[PDB]
Amino acid sequence: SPPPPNAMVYDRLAEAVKAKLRQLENPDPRFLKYGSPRPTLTDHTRILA
């Protein structure tokens, strides 16, 4: 006799916040190949003509 986790509105509004957060956990490593948030200093000589 505990309520099942879809019976109360506040219990099944909480299984939908856990499912929105499980798609922030498996990053695709082909979309992370060239960009970096750390600044580096680079050379621009080939394009400066």
Binding site: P2, P3, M8, D11
Partner: protein
């Protein structure tokens, strides 16, 4: 050594007795001010 022992045992019987009457007044006064809270009914909407 103790020339005060008879003035002392007679003052301590008068004030332990008088103070156990104020303890019966203060436990009634406490349970009278707290009875609206201790018997109230409350409905809330939550189950588990």
């Amino acid at each position: 050594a103790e020339p005060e022992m008879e003035e002392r045992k007679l003052m301590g019987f008068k004030w332990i007795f008088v103070l156990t009457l104020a303890l019966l007044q203060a436990g009634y006064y406490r349970r009278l001010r707290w009875s609206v809270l201790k018997s109230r009914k409350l409905v809330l909407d939550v189950v588990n």
